């Protein structure tokens, strides 16, 4: 029973935590274990609802995303920055390259890192990195807006995205931290993290969906639909609220909260 | 036979490759396999001769290293930089923290990465990172000299040192690349890499020597002495020559050479 209610709860958790630097995997294993929804169907379910959150970024950054791949039909794209530069597809590619290289080489080792004890450590270490980024970032951002970003900043963020190969570390936490440490403002680094997440997660989800295509032909459709659609709406709200929120608060509260989630992981599983 | 001659050959290889961004582990497994010197005694031997190369940095950077820990008795230390700043022990600590955290957590996974196929990949990827650092570094260094380095640069270099946990990647390659990508000059980033190597390798060697303390009581003394002493002299020459060399050449030749070493690893073992 409550198959649709469980789908909506996980969809809310996915939509809130996928793009905030608080680790969706950590929250998924907790709530999934509390709701008794574990196993291959649950893991396949949580891969499907990730597409819902991806679509939220695609919808929110529609004009810029199609602009990046060379499709522009009408109104000029809003300029986000103090300089006359423009984010390009090269920025995105440099942001992808490091994690794509290491992810394919270390595929088998990453698969064995989904133990709750490894996730708990990744939550804490990811939280420590956010704090370090807040302590060490330059006083004056080098890239105030998304369109001020340089190839060097983008590649360095890509290098930090390799830390996200550690389950629980949070891709948004790793890339936002790297961006701030490269002098990208909190706002711009969050945006670039969201844009970078689209090609990274679509390829990763397509690889996960291909290898776990085994499910009920039509029985999982009601659950998968409700979860997918909920994650989309909540991610729309969360991203919009986060970008407005991060303009006047730091990542310290998110780092402290990750320490609480790590403690939650321990008590739930041990 | 040729126990002293084999010790000197490996000592030369250790002293040349330990602090150049060309991976000593890659060269050790090649030459060790060609000389038929493999096994627990050989692995213990190659840990001992690393102390010889460490001592070379200690001798070459004697005044600065003791200065960093607060021991200064007489002539003021030479100022290396355009600003009025000074490298401090905090720079060193920030350079150590990331690799120390991840190295202790991922200890068991790192132990299983010494397969020649993993070393070959690390040689290539490390070579690609050197090229990227050469392509993406700022036109004007932010830290021309060692004493111009900031806490942010030091911590970021520490983050890149985590890549060195991959056997074959080369600690010097990872940290020099990170430094150049943070706007530290080639010369200063090499120096900081050497200084950072002293606490990192002394702790790592002490952990390796403790767990492999099993050897011939006095039979290995002649081999271990000749190797240790050779690695010291060659590292003295190599470091001095490298620092003079890097002032007018880039790391491109070192990156190309790593690709040749990766091919050598394949042909020797496969
Ligand atoms: C990265 C390139 C995108 C590739 C994947 C394409 C999306 C996949 C299919 C979606 C069907 C639903 C289409 C819904 C279209 C919404 C467009 C929109 O709402 O844009 C509004 C405004 O421009 C912004 O706020
Ligand atoms: C276009 C080609 C794309 C190829 C893609 C290959 C990338 C390698 C795998 C990455 C996911 C596996 C890492 C596991 C991360 C889960 C832990 C986590 O929660 O981080 C996510 C966070 O919610 C977000 O902010
Ligand atoms: C990082 C702090 C160092 C801790 C570990 C200490 C070294 C270990 C013992 C060495 C015995 C041999 C001592 C040899 C002393 C050489 C000093 C020297 O030659 O310095 C010359 C000049 O100051 C520079 O070029
Ligand atoms: C003070 C406490 C210190 C604690 C120390 C814990 C560090 C973790 C282990 C690091 C070595 C294992 C990584 C294996 C690297 C071998 C591959 C290689 O060749 O890189 C070296 C290169 O020669 C150089 O430039
Ligand atoms: C950790 C694993 C990483 C291994 C993967 C490495 C692959 C090579 C990547 C990029 C090549 C370098 C691209 C250089 C782009 C040129 C940019 C430039 O020249 O300057 C920037 C511009 O002037 C201001 O925005
Ligand atoms: C939503 C976005 C998803 C997009 C996913 C990324 C797809 C990669 C696209 C192009 C790079 C193709 C690889 C070949 C690299 C060529 C880059 C290059 O040539 O840059 C030099 C520049 O043209 C100086 O004139
Ligand atoms: C049986 C299982 C019951 C599960 C019940 C699910 C309903 C949770 C709803 C909202 C809380 C969302 C929790 C995650 C909120 C994001 C974390 C966060 O952002 O905290 C940082 C801080 O707010 C920076 O200001
Ligand atoms: C990848 C694993 C990493 C996890 C480990 C993270 C541990 C926290 C590290 C450092 C705390 C921050 C130290 C902040 C030092 C203050 C520096 C500063 O405030 O500015 C610099 C100075 O003004 C100009 O040189
Ligand atoms: C060859 C060198 C090898 C040395 C190996 C490193 C040993 C660590 C030393 C001190 C840090 C001790 C950890 C405690 C961190 C305190 C740092 C701190 O307080 O910095 C603030 C500063 O004092 C603002 O006033
Ligand atoms: C049976 C085994 C026989 C083994 C014979 C051992 C004697 C090798 C002596 C010198 C070559 C040293 C090789 C490593 C040299 C460093 C690599 C390097 O620096 O190349 C980069 C380029 O020079 C940038 O200008």
Q: How far apart are CA B140 and CA B129, in angstroms?
A: 20
Which residue, judged by its Cα, is nearest atom 22 of ligand 3?
B62
Residue B121: closest CA among B270, B265, B267, B269: B265
- Among B93, B99, B101, B206, name the best residue to mutate to test ligand 9's pocket (greatest count of ligand atoms within 8 A of Cβ): B93
Tokens in use for B95? 């350079």
CB distance from A132 to chain B under 8 Å? yes
Reported as half-sphere exposure (CB side, CA atoms, 13 A), residue A209 has a value of: 14
Are B144 and B137 a contacting pair, CB within 8 Å? Answer: no
Overall resolution, Å: 2.0
Q: Does A100 touch chain B (CB under 8 A)?
A: no
Is B138 in Cβ contact with A152 (below 8 Å)? yes
With contact defined as beta carbons under 8 Å apart, do B128 and A158 qualify? no
Is some CB atom of chain A closer than 8 A to the CB atom of B131?
Answer: no
Cβ B23 vs Cβ B258: under 8 Å: yes
Q: Is B9 on the interface with A (CB under 8 A)?
A: no
Please give the distance, rounded to the nearest whole angstrom, from the Cα atom of residue A200 to the centre of ligand 2: 7
Judged by CB atoms closer than 8 Å, whether chains meet at B181 and A152 is answered as yes
- Which tokens is B40 given? 């627990």
Residues of B whose CB is below 8 A from A138: 152
Question: What is the rounded distance in angstroms from the CA atom of residue B72 to the CA atom of residue B88?
Answer: 13
User: What letter does residue B184 receive in the DSSP assignment?
Assistant: B
Burial (0-12, 13-18, 19+ Cβ within 10 Å), B73? exposed
C-alpha–C-alpha distance, residues A113 and A205, integer Å: 18
A147 secondary structure, DSSP code = G
Nearest ligand to the C-alpha of residue A92? 6
The tokens for B246 are: 């890097």
Report whether A87 contacts A179 (CB < 8 A): no
DSSP state for residue B143 in the 8-state scheme: B
Which residues are bridge partners to A184 per DSSP? A143
What are the backbone angles phi and psi of residue A20, rounded to the nearest 5°? Answer: -80, 150
Residues in A closer than 8 angstroms to B105, CB to CB, are 121, 125
Closest chain B residue to A156 measured between Cα atoms? B181
* DSSP alpha helix (H) spans, chain A: 3-17, 24-34, 40-60, 62-68, 89-105, 107-111, 116-136, 151-161, 171-181, 186-211, 221-245, 252-269
User: Atom of ligand 9 at shortest distance to CA of B198?
Assistant: 1
Pocket (CB within 6 angstroms of ligand 4): B 17-18, 23-25, 99-100, 103, 164-165, 167-168, 170-172, 199-200, 203-204
Residue in chain A closest to B134 (alpha carbons) equals A152
| Ligand 10 pocket by Cβ (under 6 Å) | B 9, 12-13, 16-17, 20, 22, 31, 34-35, 253-254, 257
Chain B's closest residue to A105, CA to CA, is: B121
Do residues A265 and A43 touch, judged by C-beta distance below 8 A? no
Chain A hits for B120, CB-CB cut-off 8 Å, are: none
Q: What are the CB-based long-range contacts (under 8 Å, 24+) for A212-220?
A: A212/A40, A212/A43, A212/A44, A212/A47, A214/A40, A214/A44, A215/A41, A215/A44, A216/A41, A220/A41, A220/A44, A220/A45
How many CB pairs (< 8 A) connect A and B?
32
Residue A102 makes CB contacts below 8 A (sequence gap 6+) with A162, A165, B125
The DSSP symbol for B140 reads S
**Contact call for A109 and B105, based on CB within 8 A:** no
Tokens 């957590």, located at residue: B105
Min distance A210 CA to chain B CA atoms (Å): 27
Please tell me whether residue A120 adopts helix, strand or coil conformation. helix
User: For residue A130, which of A189, A87, A88 has the smallest C-alpha distance?
Assistant: A189
> How many Å apart are CA B116 and CA B198, to the nearest integer?
26
Cβ B160–A159 below 8 Å, yes or no?
A: yes
| Separation CA A215–CA A193 (nearest Å) | 32
Residue B183: which region, alpha, beta or left (left: phi > 0; alpha: psi -120 to 50)? Answer: left
In chain B, alpha helices (H): 3-17, 24-34, 40-60, 62-68, 89-105, 107-111, 116-136, 151-161, 171-181, 186-211, 221-245, 252-269
Distance from CA of B152 to the nearest CA of A (A): 5
Residues 6+ apart with CB under 8 A from A207: none
CA atoms within 13 A on the CB side of B123: 29
Long-range pairs, A91-94, Cβ under 8 A, ≥24:
A91/A149, A91/A151, A91/A154, A91/A192, A92/A68, A92/A154, A92/A195, A92/A196, A92/A199, A94/A151, A94/A154, A94/A155, A94/A158
Distances in whole angstroms, Cα of residue A174 to Cα of each of A8, A156, A169, B179, B246: 27, 11, 7, 19, 32
- Smallest CA–CA separation between A29 and chain B, in Å? 21
Single out the residue of B161, B152, B167 nearest to residue B96, CA to CA: B161
Q: What is the CA radius of gyration of chain A?
A: 18
Q: B151 contacts in A (CB within 8 Å)?
A: 136
Q: Per the structure block, which two tokens stand in for B263?
A: 């091919």
Measure the CA dihedral A182/A183/A186/A188, to 10°.
-90
Q: Which two tokens stand for residue B139?
A: 């036109």
How wide is the angle at C-alpha B23 spanned by C-alphas B22 and B29, nearest 5°?
A: 125
Q: How many of the other CB atoms lie within 10 Å of CB of A76?
A: 8
The Cα A177–Cα A194 span in angstroms is 13
Burial class of residue B226 in the structure, from the number of CB atoms within 10 Å of its CB (0-12 exposed, 13-18 middle, 19+ buried): buried
How many Cα atoms sit within 13 Å of B216 on the Cβ side? 10
Buried residues in A92-120 as b, exposed as e (16+ CB within 10 A): bebbbbbbbbbbebbeeeeeebeebebbb
Q: What are phi and psi of A58, to 5 degrees?
A: -60, -40
Q: How many CB atoms lie within 10 A of CB B161?
A: 27
Nearest to B254, CA basis, from B195, B180, B203, B162: B180
Nearest to B87 by CA among B210, B196, B198: B196
- Count Cβ atoms below 10 Å from residue A171 Cβ, excluding itself: 26
Structure tokens belonging to residue A53: 């959150």
Reduced to 3 states (helix: H, G, I; strand: E, B; else coil), residue A184 is strand
B171-181 vs B116-136: helix crossing angle, rounded to 10:
20
Cα–Cα nearest to B172, from B254, B80, B257: B254
């Amino acid at each position: 029973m409550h198959s649709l209610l469980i789908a909506a709860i996980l969809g809310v958790v996915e939509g809130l935590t996928e793009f905030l630097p608080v680790s969706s995997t950590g929250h998924m294993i907790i709530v999934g274990h509390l709701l008794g929804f574990e196993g291959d169907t649950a893991k396949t379910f949580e891969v499907v609802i990730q597409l819902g959150s991806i679509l939220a970024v695609v919808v929110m950054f529609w004009r810029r995303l199609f602009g990046l791949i060379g499709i522009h039909f009408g109104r000029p794209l809003q300029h986000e920055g103090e300089s006359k530069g423009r984010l390009t597809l090269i920025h995105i590619l440099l942001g992808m390259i490091p994690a794509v290289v290491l992810g394919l080489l270390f595929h088998d080792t990453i698969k064995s890192l989904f133990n709750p004890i490894n996730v708990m450590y990744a939550l804490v270490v990811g939280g420590l990195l956010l704090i370090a980024a807040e302590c060490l970032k330059p006083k004056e951002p080098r890239a105030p807006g998304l369109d001020d970003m340089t190839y060097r900043q983008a590649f360095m963020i890509g290098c930090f995205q390799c830390l996200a190969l550690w389950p629980g570390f949070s891709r948004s936490g790793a890339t936002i931290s790297g961006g701030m440490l490269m002098g990208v403002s909190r706002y711009a680094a969050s945006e670039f993290s969201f844009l970078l997440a689209v090609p990274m997660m679509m390829g990763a989800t397509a690889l996960d969906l291909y290898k776990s295509w085994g499910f009920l032909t039509s029985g999982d459709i009601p659950m998968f639909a409700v979860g997918f659609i909920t994650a989309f709406v909540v991610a729309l709200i969360a991203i919009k609220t986060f970008l407005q929120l991060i303009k006047r608060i730091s990542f310290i509260p998110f780092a402290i909260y990750r320490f609480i989630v790590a403690a939650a992981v321990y008590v739930v599983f041990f």
